[PDB]
Design an enzyme around this catalytic site. Structure first.
Site, PDB file in Angstrom:
ATOM      1  N   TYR A 204      -1.066  11.121   2.446  1.00 14.07           N
ATOM      2  CA  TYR A 204      -1.558  11.042   1.465  1.00 14.07           C
ATOM      3  C   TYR A 204      -2.146  12.741   1.196  1.00 14.07           C
ATOM      4  O   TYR A 204      -3.263  13.229   0.062  1.00 14.07           O
ATOM      5  CB  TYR A 204      -3.627  10.731   2.036  1.00 14.07           C
ATOM      6  CG  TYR A 204      -3.738   9.179   2.265  1.00 14.07           C
ATOM      7  CD1 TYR A 204      -3.944   8.781   1.322  1.00 14.07           C
ATOM      8  CD2 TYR A 204      -3.565   9.177   3.463  1.00 14.07           C
ATOM      9  CE1 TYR A 204      -3.708   7.089   1.301  1.00 14.07           C
ATOM     10  CE2 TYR A 204      -4.040   7.577   3.124  1.00 14.07           C
ATOM     11  CZ  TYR A 204      -4.132   6.909   2.205  1.00 14.07           C
ATOM     12  OH  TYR A 204      -4.322   5.117   2.490  1.00 14.07           O
TER      13      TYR A 204
ATOM     14  N   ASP B 153       0.761  -0.798  -0.206  1.00 15.34           N
ATOM     15  CA  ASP B 153       0.295   0.220   0.146  1.00 15.34           C
ATOM     16  C   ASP B 153       1.304   1.542  -0.210  1.00 15.34           C
ATOM     17  O   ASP B 153       1.611   1.877  -0.637  1.00 15.34           O
ATOM     18  CB  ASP B 153      -1.332  -0.728   1.048  1.00 15.34           C
ATOM     19  CG  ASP B 153      -1.833   1.068   1.240  1.00 15.34           C
ATOM     20  OD1 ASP B 153      -3.134   1.204   0.493  1.00 15.34           O
ATOM     21  OD2 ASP B 153      -1.898   2.308   2.047  1.00 15.34           O
TER      22      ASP B 153
ATOM     23  N   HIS C  73      -6.798  -6.872   0.042  1.00 15.30           N
ATOM     24  CA  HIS C  73      -6.373  -5.698   0.151  1.00 15.30           C
ATOM     25  C   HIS C  73      -5.595  -5.591   1.554  1.00 15.30           C
ATOM     26  O   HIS C  73      -3.950  -5.442   1.145  1.00 15.30           O
ATOM     27  CB  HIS C  73      -6.539  -4.386   0.737  1.00 15.30           C
ATOM     28  CG  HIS C  73      -5.835  -3.389   1.003  1.00 15.30           C
ATOM     29  ND1 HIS C  73      -5.309  -2.622  -0.034  1.00 15.30           N
ATOM     30  CD2 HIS C  73      -5.441  -2.328   2.350  1.00 15.30           C
ATOM     31  CE1 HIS C  73      -4.602  -1.599   0.197  1.00 15.30           C
ATOM     32  NE2 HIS C  73      -4.505  -1.783   1.783  1.00 15.30           N
TER      33      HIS C  73
HETATM   34  O1  LIG Z   1      -6.736   0.324   0.516  1.00 13.75           O
HETATM   35  C1  LIG Z   1      -7.967   0.849   1.528  1.00 13.75           C
HETATM   36  C2  LIG Z   1      -6.265   2.313   1.692  1.00 13.75           C
HETATM   37  C3  LIG Z   1      -7.405   2.597   3.063  1.00 13.75           C
HETATM   38  C4  LIG Z   1      -8.310   2.186   3.534  1.00 13.75           C
HETATM   39 CL1  LIG Z   1      -8.760   3.497   5.088  1.00 13.75          CL
HETATM   40  C5  LIG Z   1      -9.517   1.395   3.402  1.00 13.75           C
HETATM   41  C6  LIG Z   1      -8.632   0.541   2.111  1.00 13.75           C
HETATM   42  C7  LIG Z   1      -8.965  -1.259   2.409  1.00 13.75           C
HETATM   43  C8  LIG Z   1      -9.344  -1.571   0.834  1.00 13.75           C
HETATM   44  C9  LIG Z   1     -10.044  -2.572   0.942  1.00 13.75           C
HETATM   45  N1  LIG Z   1     -10.732  -2.548   2.872  1.00 13.75           N
HETATM   46  O2  LIG Z   1     -10.388  -1.262   3.096  1.00 13.75           O
END
Ligand SMILES: Oc1ccc(Cl)cc1-c1ccno1
Ligand SMILES: Oc1ccc(Cl)cc1-c1ccno1
Lengths: 546, 546
Positions: free
Chosen positions: B465, B334, B523
């Site tokens: 962000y 991420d 994710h």
């Molecule tokens: O990718 C993400 C990025 C940020 C936040 Cl707060 C949540 C998600 C995510 C993907 C699936 N569930 O939460």
């Protein structure tokens, strides 16, 4: 007045220069003179090399562009490039051959020590070659010694463009007349001079350093041999491992490669290895310098039994277990040296190699109590003084600055005769209240030890001496064993407590034992003779510990 | 009722047994049957082997004594030993060939998970051979999974002597009827049985495990595939590096070998790599799992600009500098995945290899504002919600347990549709107040994240962000570059935010890119599919990162 010194990398802090290798390649391949240096600079401010030096492209993207320029140049010169011609090979070799110009770095080190702000200003590239690590290592070693590193490929500007000089001045927070700028390229020196900076054209280092000492008024040439690099506690990686519920072990960690676990003596700190840590990491080792149990940021439980060799060794094994280390080379001094011999005897599978500074390996005598044995030698009287809980603590904790200044002295500055300590009624009874500062330590280094000992004092450290019967019983279990893993014994000529002759029978129990010996060296080995400790340990590590 | 399970090492937790190799050697060299096993046990309780197993002598001292017994035995049998006969070679090979009996360890893991106290009781030696590290590694891997490791050479007692069984009982703090004892030697099983312990003679593992499940009432055979080993935060080595005056970076460190730097995403922790850390250390790597800036024990300054990619990357380079690491392989997920691509673009010389989980590399568009680009995709709406300082902080900090339970869910348990977050007025507006616990996480794991986020909350993490324009301007400087160092892109089929199709054009900028793909993965990659993440990363590391 000058307060800043700026150094170029290629041809100044690192030798030989890349420019010189292109000329060398031309001669070796019998190519027209300047052909390669001409293809290198082709297009000038609009060429492939400028884009590379500004960080627009990486070194691997630049290689084929240099190849095309070489073909273009050879075509015009009406010559043919050899069939085996490779820019990748030429540059790999050039970058690999380039080493730190040690007297230039030494001069930069001296200026910074005298209050100068120092910086490296370099026209460099983003290196993505398979062999990029060599350069990454070179840069790492150099950069630590400077306040600033300004790289053309990171700032998007190059020498001789005026903007990079204005950028340098802004990062230095200095006016041009306050700066010395050393460069091997006349054209790159020109804008600094035009701005009013003192400039030095670097051909041979000696002449450049003569010019540098004349203009700074600081001796840089013919200077005494400098001490090895030391540690700034606040700049180290600090590690913490809980070995059991109430016990945490603190260590400082530096470098990559085989794990080397440094174990200090009494009454010391991880900081006692300050001159070894950078040197061993530079030599290709992952250094783990401990605060032994009872010291600094490591836990200091009050119980005597928490400090017997059996528990101390068990905890060091747990420490390796929790770090995920199957082995480490164990290097110890004084009490740490004793721990390290016992690690080799009881946990050889976890000990890659073993080295001791001053502490000899002497097997337990099963027909004599350790208290009897300690009374037999007048040099070990201080150990009897350490027996009664509270007595040595009160003397050592009374004035910490006096404690460390009295202890930490070279063989010719001693203020403590370690005999008749019990009879005299203490270590410092015939010692001054305000001892002078030993040539081995600075006031600031003494104050680091004072700050460390304010947390737990001397109870835990003194408890290392309060397990004689317990250690003797445990050591007797090892009497049929021999130490057969790689081992080094380092003796110190002038340590009047851990005398070199005490180590004379060691080969009977460690047949393959290797030795080191340091002349004019007192008890505080690591700080008394750091250069020589580093040379002995690095040579032994590279030959016996991988 | 049983509450303790004790396992032997040779022939039980590690296969094949040494005893079997002596018989194998006899057959290979066509020596009389039992000759080697007879020379091995020669003298019984008074012989060389018993002294070795009790820790009186080391393995290297034992080798020539075994050689003399072999000569004595062959002489009586009226046979000649081959001219090339070597006990050292036989045992080196035997020890080296011996591997962990995976289904036996799995059964021990299951019993401990169900509340059993587990221990290894072994007749072993003090190994000082040049190749001792292999065994040290085996023991390290095994011992972590057990409450106790009792070694004959450390306690000075051996099986089948009655005292070692009384010693085991005392360490377990259990009565004999409460203990299952598994051994491949009938004679060593006899005293445990005589004491009243349940005993299992281990020949083939399947039968022993059938006997073990029958007697414990716990399913041990035909069980579902277990998860990889996780991390107990209190058992890890915790490291701290000050990268600048107000910024300290915290990391967890495990293993030896090439440095592998793990970089988590939002809103995570070093703990998000809990299933990777033991696996990567076991695979032969030195793992450094970060708390990224703004998280856990790392500093969390309030300023937005402290979290732009340029500063985050600069600090990661300083982190390597202070640790004495010229390079590390950078693996990110991420936001960490984004950081890791920028480390490769700006500092290739410091990046050994680069891998990203879910986060694709997409070059900045110089003809479009990042805010414009984010509005174009409905999946990135949550990023616009994160813009206004304080809004997302209040929702995320309101109920931490609810935050982590709502976020950390598998693809089939989602409670958050990440579209029209702004329109809806938050992430959790259509989410329950008390979400159920996802099959991916335990209550205790959720509480670790809750405890971590209590220190600094979500300001620092959300600031990652809030630097869109700043990051875009910086990324535009890299537009003429390509990523040419070893690189891996891992896509997750069911990540509906970082969709696998977003990674489709990556080969244009990373020509030599290698890929991994995980089916039925959401994710939270590392915890959703740990076994498969471990397999992909280990295979890529061994082939591309050394
Ligand atoms: O990718 C993400 C990025 C940020 C936040 Cl707060 C949540 C998600 C995510 C993907 C699936 N569930 O939460
Ligand atoms: O060896 C030593 C051990 C302990 C203490 Cl407190 C001092 C010394 C020592 C040797 C020389 N000067 O101090």
């Amino acid at each position: 007045t000058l307060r800043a010194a700026v150094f170029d990398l290629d041809g100044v802090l690192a030798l030989p220069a890349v420019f010189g290798v292109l000329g060398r390649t031309e001669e070796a391949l019998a190519l027209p003179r300047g052909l390669l240096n001409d293809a290198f600079q082709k297009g000038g401010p609009e060429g492939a090399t400028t884009r590379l030096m500004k960080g627009e492209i990486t070194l691997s993207q630049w290689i084929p562009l240099m190849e095309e320029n070489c073909r273009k140049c050879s075509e015009t010169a009406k010559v043919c490039l050899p069939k085996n011609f490779s820019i990748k090979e030429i540059f790999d070799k050039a970058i690999s051959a380039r080493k730190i110009n040690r007297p230039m770095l030494q001069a930069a080190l001296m200026l910074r020590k005298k209050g100068f702000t120092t910086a490296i200003l370099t026209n460099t590239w983003l290196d993505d070659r398979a062999e990029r690590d060599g350069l990454a290592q070179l840069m790492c070693e150099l950069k630590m010694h400077f306040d600033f590193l300004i790289e053309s490929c990171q700032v998007g500007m190059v020498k001789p463009e005026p903007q990079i000089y204005k950028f340098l001045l802004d990062t230095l927070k200095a006016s041009p007349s306050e700066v010395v700028f050393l460069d091997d390229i006349g054209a790159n020196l020109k804008p600094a001079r035009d701005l009013g900076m003192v400039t030095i054209l670097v051909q041979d280092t000696d002449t450049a350093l003569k010019e540098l000492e004349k203009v700074t008024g600081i001796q840089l040439l013919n200077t005494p041999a400098p001490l090895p690099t030391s540690c700034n506690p606040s700049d180290m990686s600090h590690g913490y491992v809980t070995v059991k519920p109430r016990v945490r072990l603190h260590f400082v960690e530096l470098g990559s490669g085989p794990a080397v676990c440094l174990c200090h003596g009494f009454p010391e700190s991880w900081y006692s290895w300050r001159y070894q840590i950078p040197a061993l990491a530079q030599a290709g080792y992952r250094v783990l310098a401990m605060d032994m149990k009872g010291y600094g940021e490591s836990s200091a439980p009050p119980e005597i039994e928490e400090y017997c060799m059996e528990v101390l060794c068990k905890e060091m094994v747990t420490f390796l277990d929790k770090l995920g280390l199957s082995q480490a080379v164990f290097i110890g001094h004084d009490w740490g040296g004793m721990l390290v011999w016992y690690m080799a005897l009881f946990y050889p599978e976890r000990v890659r190699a073993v080295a001791s500074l001053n502490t000899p390996f002497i097997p337990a005598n099963p027909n004599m109590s350790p208290l009897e044995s300690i009374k037999a030698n007048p040099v070990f009287d201080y150990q009897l003084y350490f027996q009664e809980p509270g007595v040595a603590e009160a003397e050592l904790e009374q004035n910490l600055s006096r404690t460390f200044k009295s202890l930490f002295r070279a063989s010719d500055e001693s203020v403590l005769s370690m005999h008749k300590v019990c009879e005299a009624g203490g270590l410092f009874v015939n010692s001054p209240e305000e001892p002078s500062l030993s040539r081995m330590v600075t006031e600031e280094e003494i104050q680091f030890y004072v700050q460390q000992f304010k947390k737990s004092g001397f109870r835990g450290p003194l408890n290392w001496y309060r397990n004689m019967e317990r250690n003797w019983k445990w050591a007797c279990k090892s009497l049929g064993r021999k130490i057969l893993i790689p081992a080094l014994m380092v003796t110190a000529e002038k340590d009047f407590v851990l005398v070199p002759q005490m180590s004379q029978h060691m080969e009977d129990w460690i047949p393959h034992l290797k030795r080191g010996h340091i002349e004019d060296c007192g008890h505080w080995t690591q700080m008394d003779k750091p250069t020589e400790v580093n040379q002995i340990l690095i040579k032994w590590l590279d030959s016996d510990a991988r």
